RNA sequence: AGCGUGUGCCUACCCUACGCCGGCAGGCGCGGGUAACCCGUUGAACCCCAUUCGUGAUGGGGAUCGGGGAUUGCAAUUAUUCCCCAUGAACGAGGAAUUCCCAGUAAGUGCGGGUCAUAAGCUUGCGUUGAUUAAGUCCCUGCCCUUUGUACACACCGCCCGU
């Protein structure tokens, strides 16, 4: 029941909104990110991810699309996507919850087993 | 071996006020340490009572330095 | 003056902990969670209190006024890169807190972490390092 | 005009020494007598130069120890100073014949040397020689000065001013002639 | 796409844009008066220089 | 104060005075040096003086952790680094044992070089302040020479007797 808030804007309002100024509505690593440069040099890959993402499958469960590309910030315009990121040996299917916003997909896929000793 | 842990005062009561001010000019040597050790009371209280002492005129310079003060008594003559 | 002056509060009952009274005021109040010994020198400041009186022969006036520039120091000129919780993630305002909301927060934020399934929130959950440094030397005070 | 070297304000003359085994290895006297208590060096070449050097300047130098001292040679001669003050307006007495009657009451006198395996205790009574006998005297000061002024209120100014006076007089409330008189103990107990 | 793709990773900082230029590896490189080898080609080839050891 | 270093071949990445903006980390147009000329008289630290503190896990100690802002790089998340405000844990001079040193020496204290796009808790140099003790011994751990003993010689960490 409760209504996610997010600096102060709405969702819809998140959505409806440009880089320019969601460089402020981000933190300092961020805003040095988006502001470093084109995303052509390297970026081509998030280019060409954005448009995947942009392919819409119909009113059901999104479909799943994974990707080698640990470095990518989440967009509010991908709220409610699925999608595996690559940690080294296999794709961790994970829902992007309308609380990604300021992260990285590395944030979210871990790469080492949590370790549980036995005997020496 | 009693621990005995010290709780110095901020400020004077009564009995302290005139109880310095009749034994303190009364001594050989006075330093805030050994007012602080005497009457139980902090080191930079001792500091402030022997400045107000020293504008009194009731006791004079020795020597100054940033770590400790020197004072001593007047002459009974 | 340095006798001893009437009604000389010993214990301050301020914001439901125990404050000090024969602690200097720049540093009786840092006492308080949340509040250190930098910005308490903005506060005095602020408002019109010397920094040579002790904390226990303040009155009401003047702890009231101290209680304000606490609660709301925004419009006090008090500069917005001097606070503790700057842009909040939830709301996005400028606030300093005081061990309430503080507490709470800090507490809310370990459970949006760990809700939200971020391995900084794992490790808190697990009960390790989160800054990225060596466990295998040190930490040996985790677990028996 | 050098009329006189004034150690500062205090007079290098008319002190009297009263043990005649320490005559020419105590130097304040119409020679070794500065305004200060820091030379320039060469005093630790030889094998007996260190006897000429003037008492106030080894204590000086021996008042530095335990790592975070080293080498402040300035604040150890302030507290010198700082200490002849307290020293001259305490007793009434000239500052410098409190340290020359005080290293001859703080002098152990007879020595007990460990022989034999490691770990067997076997202690065979030696004399203690002159040069030796000051050496420990001014080591056994600046200790006991130093113990008492660590986690006290007490400033080492006056702290290393009590320490002096109680050796002076030999109260034994002193932690140098406490040291002293259980070694004495000590070498007596077995010889 | 491999000609775009052989070698579009960029060497142009880092330790491995620069080599030794003796042997040719890449391990304790000395950078200092542009000698850019490594410690060594330097010691064997010392003399001719006319780095001696004087000290 | 003294050793230093400084625009590099593919190889792009140098050291910096001066003016403004900003608390700060930092940012822009401006001038020098391919070096006894410019940073630079390298206004370094420890020390010196004057306040505040007063034996209280305290204004000691800064680990852990939250939020924010800049720089380097194509890319920082398992925080590169730096800055700001909070958070203020253990630790009350350390058991058995063990390391280094004797004169500008130990020790305290900072500055250069190496790694370096971003870069020192390491290392190599340098300078400041500057001592205690000793001019000896073979007791311990070992070394050199002579004599003697040996069932050893892959050489005592050797060889060997019996249930």
């Given amino acids: 029941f409760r209504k996610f808030t997010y600096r102060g804007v709405d969702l819809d309002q998140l959505l409806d909104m440009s880089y320019e100024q969601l460089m402020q509505l981000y933190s300092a690593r961020q805003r040095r990110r988006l502001s470093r440069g084109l995303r052509r040099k390297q970026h081509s890959l998030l280019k060409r991810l954005r448009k995947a993402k942009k392919e819409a499958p119909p009113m059901e469960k999104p479909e799943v699309v994974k990707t080698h590309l640990r470095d990518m910030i989440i967009l509010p315009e991908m709220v409610g996507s699925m999608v595996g990121v690559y940690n080294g040996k296999t794709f961790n299917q994970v829902e992007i919850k309308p609380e990604m916003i300021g992260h990285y997909l590395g944030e979210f896929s871990i790469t080492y087993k949590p370790v549980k000793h036995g005997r020496p | 071996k009693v621990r005995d842990k010290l709780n110095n005062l901020v400020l004077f009561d009564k009995a302290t006020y005139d109880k310095l001010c009749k034994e303190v000019p009364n001594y050989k040597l006075i330093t805030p340490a050994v007012v602080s050790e005497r009457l139980k009371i902090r080191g930079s209280l001792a500091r402030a009572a022997l400045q107000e002492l020293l504008s009194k005129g009731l006791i004079k310079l020795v020597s100054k330095h940033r770590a400790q003060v020197i004072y001593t008594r007047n002459t009974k003559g | ?144 | 005009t050098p009329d006189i070297k004034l150690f500062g304000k205090w007079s290098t003359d008319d002190v009297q020494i009263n043990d005649i085994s320490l005559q020419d290895y105590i130097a304040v006297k119409e020679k070794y007598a500065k305004y200060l208590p820091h030379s320039a060096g060469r005093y630790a070449a030889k094998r007996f130069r260190k006897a000429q050097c003037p008492i106030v300047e080894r204590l000086t130098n021996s008042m530095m120890m335990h790592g975070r001292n080293n080498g402040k040679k300035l604040m150890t001669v302030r507290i010198v100073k700082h200490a002849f003050e307290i020293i001259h307006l305490l007793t009434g007495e000239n500052p410098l014949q409190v340290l020359v009657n005080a290293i001859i009451n703080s002098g152990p006198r007879e020595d007990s040397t460990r022989i034999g395996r490691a770990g067997t205790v076997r202690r065979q009574a030696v004399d203690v020689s002159p040069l030796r006998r000051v050496n420990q005297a001014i080591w056994l000061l600046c200790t006991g000065a130093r113990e008492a002024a660590f986690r006290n209120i007490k400033t080492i100014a006056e702290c290393l001013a009590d320490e002096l006076i109680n050796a002076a007089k030999g109260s034994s409330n002193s932690y140098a002639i406490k040291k002293k008189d259980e070694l004495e103990r000590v070498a007596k107990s077995n010889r | 796409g491999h000609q775009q793709l052989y070698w579009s990773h960029p060497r142009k900082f880092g330790q491995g844009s620069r080599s030794c230029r003796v042997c040719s590896n890449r391990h304790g490189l000395i950078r200092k008066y542009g000698l850019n080898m490594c410690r060594q080609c330097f010691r064997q080839y010392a003399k001719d220089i006319g780095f001696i050891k004087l000290d």
């Fill in chain 3, 1 to 144: 003056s340095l006798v001893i002056p009437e009604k000389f509060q010993h214990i301050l009952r301020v914001l439901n902990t125990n404050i000090d009274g024969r602690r200097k005021i720049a540093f009786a109040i840092t006492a308080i969670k949340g509040v250190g010994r930098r910005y308490a020198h903005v506060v005095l400041r602020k408002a019109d209190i010397d920094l040579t009186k002790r904390a226990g022969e303040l009155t009401e006036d003047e702890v009231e006024r101290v209680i304000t520039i606490m609660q709301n120091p925004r419009q006090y000129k008090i500069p917005d890169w001097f606070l503790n919780r700057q842009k909040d993630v939830k709301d996005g305002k400028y606030s300093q807190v005081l061990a309430n909301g503080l507490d709470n927060k800090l507490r809310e934020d370990l459970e949006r972490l760990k809700k939200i399934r971020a391995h900084r929130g794992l490790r808190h959950f697990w009960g390790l390092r989160v800054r990225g440094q060596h466990t295998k030397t040190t930490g040996r005070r985790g677990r028996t």
